[PDB]
């Protein structure tokens, strides 16, 4: 599923990402935007054997566990395929844990490079919250 900006923004508010641990909804839409371009089926295999899954490109070495990643910590207690769902619940549930892990949203490169210290609220702008 390829979400649309406003749609996903609403879905994320739907799931409590609106102002979660200091992060305004804008940050999450922007992070999704650059991490997967709102594509929930987005997967990025790494040379290191792991793979990033879903709308927020969660990594299979630390958060989810596919069936092909030695040492996977699987901290989000979910098969990575659940991050490829049209329903963002699993990704969000994981993202909240990840953003609480101590590095903030800096846990996502894409977010750091294209959203950090930027007018993020612009991504929820023009939407029906």
């Amino acid at each position: 599923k390829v979400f649309g900006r406003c749609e996903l923004a609403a879905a994320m508010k739907r799931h409590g990402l609106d102002n979660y641990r200091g992060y305004s909804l804008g940050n999450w839409v922007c992070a999704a935007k650059f991490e997967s371009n709102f594509n929930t089926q987005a997967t990025n295999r790494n040379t290191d054997g792991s793979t990033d899954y879903g709308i927020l490109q969660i990594n299979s070495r630390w958060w989810c566990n596919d069936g092909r990643t030695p040492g996977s910590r699987n901290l989000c207690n979910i098969p990575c395929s659940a991050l490829l769902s049209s329903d963002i619940t699993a990704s969000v549930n994981c993202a909240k844990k990840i953003v609480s892990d101590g590095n903030g949203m800096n846990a996502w490169v894409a977010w750091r490079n294209r959203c950090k210290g930027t007018d993020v609220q612009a991504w929820i702008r023009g939407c029906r919250l």
Partner: antibody
Amino acid sequence: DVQLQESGPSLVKPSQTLSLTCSVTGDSITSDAWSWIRKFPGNRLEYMGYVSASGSTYYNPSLKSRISITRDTSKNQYYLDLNSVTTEDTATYYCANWDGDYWGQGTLVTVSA
Amino acid sequence: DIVLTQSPATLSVTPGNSVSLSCRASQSIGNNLHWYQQKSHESPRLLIKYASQSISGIPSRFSGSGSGTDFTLSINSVETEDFGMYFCQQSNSWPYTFGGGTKLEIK
């Protein structure tokens, strides 16, 4: 399978550090975030703070530098070091993983005169 | 600091009757609300995660609902051992906070 065992002096004196230990069984402390929660008389619970699975710690601003959560990655247990407590700090201290799934039995550590 | 006001403070009931517990946030917290059961001489137990998500092992008669600022825990056909404290907790903003608690007891 998973068990959170709390131990430590259930009675400390004014001005000195309140220290508690939470032994974790069936689950390595680096594979989960862990916290300390205390219940004050009158069912007043307080989230003291926590250590992430990656070592980042978070402390409830209510404590103010008085709190230090550290962990023993070898014996697989973590601690609570609360400086200069007072009658106020008297409560039952709990340790549970971040997700809320596991908890320690709960140990009441009072601080009377 | 997000405040959680639970009501009623106490709630008496006869096993078999159904109850509805309330938890209101002094600020919209999305769905970052969690429910705990607290029996005397015992430690909090996670009943409902994120407003309504069920916890493997918790009896079906338990269920949560709500969003934003108002949340509800529903216990249908309360049983003799469902009696105890009930606390809600927001994980939305740091420092995480707990509700004042609703004491469920026999009529």
